[PDB]
Amino acid sequence: LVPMVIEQTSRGERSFDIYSRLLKERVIFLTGQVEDHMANLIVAQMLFLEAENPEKDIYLYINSPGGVITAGMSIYDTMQFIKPDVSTICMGQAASMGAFLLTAGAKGKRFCLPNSRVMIHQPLGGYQGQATDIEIHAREILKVKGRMNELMALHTGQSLEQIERDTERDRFLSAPEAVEYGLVDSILTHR
Amino acid sequence: LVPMVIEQTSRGERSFDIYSRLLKERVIFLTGQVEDHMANLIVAQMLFLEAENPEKDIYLYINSPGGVITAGMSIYDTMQFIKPDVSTICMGQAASMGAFLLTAGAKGKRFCLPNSRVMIHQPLGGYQGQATDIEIHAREILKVKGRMNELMALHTGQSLEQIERDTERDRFLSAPEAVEYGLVDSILTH
Amino acid sequence: RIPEKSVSQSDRDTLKNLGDRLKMLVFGQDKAIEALTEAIKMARAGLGHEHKPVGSFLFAGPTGVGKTEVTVQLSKALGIELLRFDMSEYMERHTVSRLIGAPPGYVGFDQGGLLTDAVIKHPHAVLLLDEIEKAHPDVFNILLQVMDNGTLTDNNGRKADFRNVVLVMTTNAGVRETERKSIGLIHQDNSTDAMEEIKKIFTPEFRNRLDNIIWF
Amino acid sequence: RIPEKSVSQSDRDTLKNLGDRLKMLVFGQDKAIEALTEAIKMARAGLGHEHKPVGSFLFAGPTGVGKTEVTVQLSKALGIELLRFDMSEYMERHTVSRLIGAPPGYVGFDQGGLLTDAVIKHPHAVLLLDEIEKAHPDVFNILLQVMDNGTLTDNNGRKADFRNVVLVMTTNAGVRETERKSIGLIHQDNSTDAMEEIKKIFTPEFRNRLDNIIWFDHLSTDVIHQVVDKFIVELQVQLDQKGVSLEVSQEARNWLAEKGYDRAMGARPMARVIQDNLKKPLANELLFGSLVDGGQVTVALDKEKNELTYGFQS
Ligand SMILES: Nc1ncnc2c1ncn2[C@@H]1O[C@H](COP(=O)(O)OP(=O)(O)OP(O)(O)=S)[C@@H](O)[C@H]1O
Ligand SMILES: Nc1ncnc2c1ncn2[C@@H]1O[C@H](COP(=O)(O)OP(=O)(O)OP(O)(O)=S)[C@@H](O)[C@H]1O
Ligand SMILES: [Mg+2]
């Protein structure tokens, strides 16, 4: 059940849900596994807010355990194409795709909470198929893997070798460690 | 199904769920297995009520049975960041994350019921995989576990060594005994 | 049958002392008084609009913070009547007929109109349309011609021309957004949201006609 | 009370110079002046419609583009009465009785009709219906016979003559659609929705008996410079009555134009800056000070300060 909230205007008061009312203030809420339908909804909220006020800055709350890489590309491409500067704030944890979208945020506005968590792991490509099919499919993950490392490298600024060395296995980064590594610029300052 | 209560507004009365009508009264019902969606929903309610009144506190009735620490930690981070404190009224089962979240409440405003029980235990995750992967999971899980014990000990003020010894194994603390331990200020007056 | 102060242009002592007299009566609104006094001075200096009103002012700010005190005191200082209309009553679609008057063949035709009759009886006066935001959009449309042309044709056909009156409209649209802080973890800059909210509530045609939007 | 046939030499000069005069008063919007002037020429020439008005034009454009100024000035140039009927008042169907009069046996029958009486009193005049869109859709039906048959019957049965009347209706219906920002990666097309709105707002029959639908374009930066000059001329006329004189540097005019230039609000903001920047300082001096008599005001701007530098030497 989504809680209902009330707003006020000269004409009267309208009833809206918690997410919509908060979305009226340019605050998006990303939650749960990344699905194609989920990503379609997130990008839709960005395009709507872009027209409403381009000068203002969106706030994409990235609290998810990750998912399909393809879905995230739509969110990542949308986050850049729009004129506003998306601010990514982690709340509880950052997964592989969550981390990539976290670093993709506009430099100078990325923030994280003191007890936030982060994680980056190599994509999983375990499947059974024909010998010929396996080679074609396997070639694709290498390009995406290298592509993913290059994109985060540009935002993070670390050399490609640094990303390759760290991504060799699963790695977790705490909130203070995140700023040191360069995933985000600073911790969330008191309001 | 939920009730339909007719609140009184100047323009006209508007039906609302029991959760929404009580949300107007700064009540945030927390219940069920800790989930990212559930945790995300609870923090959204608190942020909306902060605009209504910064000085007034935001009530919080917690009946969570425990769950993923990362999902639950989201509420803890936002709670400290928000200007209005949260009255953590624990009226039911308080698991590790639930009790941990309950302890997060500001001093002088927490509450607990004597009938209820509050237990604190270390999180347990049966991760399986390669030996190298297990070592990595062991590092981060112990690190976050230490972080939970250090932040929890900070608010109560008791020595960290004492809290670590109590959390080494599963244990339950009676609600009146919790007052002496420092988990809560005192039980409800009446 | 008026105080004779307005007819005498040479009596400029009141205008120079208008700010001082108004400032003692109202405290904390010196900026509003300065804008109001300067506007009347140009109107009395021969720089007034040929067909538009003396001045259209939208009083936007908090409720009770010196908005209607300047209007009542101004009328006494300028020796003109005070026309106060409550817009809360005029919130329905058909309420507009009360002010302009009902057309021929309908009930209320004999009544010339609450607004049209008052301006005709008192060409020099202060029109206080308090709670303008509450007013129906139809009422806003009527005001467009008032600022642009200066005359409201009545049911009887008499042109209710009032170019000497000073129009003041009290609203609380801006005070709402500024008082309420943003939502979400990171705070947001809402310095300009008040003006944007006013833009949404009031049609551009209405806002363009206004001389200035006073702030309290 | 209509223009005589076999137009005289004096009247001829006015018709050829009408376009030039209107353009000077209202800069830009050349198409609007061309439609009004050409229609009047044909009527005087004897090629006008036998039973229709001189011209029925719908001026749809952004705010402050001079939709009503071109009509008010036209009446002044031709020395004909301006029958300006505000359509904001006629927002409901019941208001139709005011224009044509109440039927027999009902209150207000004696009062008559404003539109019928006005046209009868002034056969040759410019009928300006401002904010036509804001009026009830049913009110537009009354104009159908006027645009096609040229006659509107009154409650008493009197028929008005609209053959010499210039019907001009101003609306800002399409302004909202054009100004609204589209949503999507690729910017959507513009200027198409504005025409669609008029089609929705007005029935096909209404748009089928209209001589033309002139679209008023947004004022350009160059046009705004001329607008500032026009406002300064009005201020100079007011000051001349008091004997005061005003001179503004060319640099100051350009600076003031940029300060108040607004595409959405058109030319009206220019008056506001003129009032605040020029009228307000002069107001204090005009009442008490050097400007009381003699004037000889000189105004310029300082590049470093970026503020106006007024001068008063009586
Ligand atoms: N800022 C102020 N300065 C001086 N007197 C004030 C001020 N605000 C309120 N008052 C007094 O409030 C009295 C009561 O008048 P009200 O109409 O209730 O309030 P108001 O502020 O004049 O107008 P509104 O309509 O309430 S905003 C007036 O007679 C004033 O003397
Ligand atoms: N094209 C223009 N050229 C010169 N002055 C203009 C022009 N358009 C507007 N103005 C100035 O602005 C004043 C007011 O313009 P309006 O006649 O109210 O414009 P409008 O677009 O017809 O308004 P509506 O009908 O309210 S949308 C005129 O009297 C001029 O001083
Ligand atoms: Mg107009």
Author numbering:
A (entry chain H): 2 to 192
B (entry chain N): 2 to 191
C (entry chain E): 435 to 650
D (entry chain D): 435 to 748
Could you give the paper's own sentences about this structure?
Each ClpA subunit has two AAA+ modules, called D1 and D2, that associate in the hexamer to form two stacked rings. Here we present high-resolution cryo-EM structures of Escherichia coli ClpAPS complexes, showing how ClpA pore loops interact with the ClpS N-terminal extension (NTE), which is normally intrinsically disordered.
In classes I and II, residues 2–15 of the ClpS NTE were built into density in the D2 portion of the channel, but this NTE region was not visible in class III, presumably as a consequence of its conformational heterogeneity.
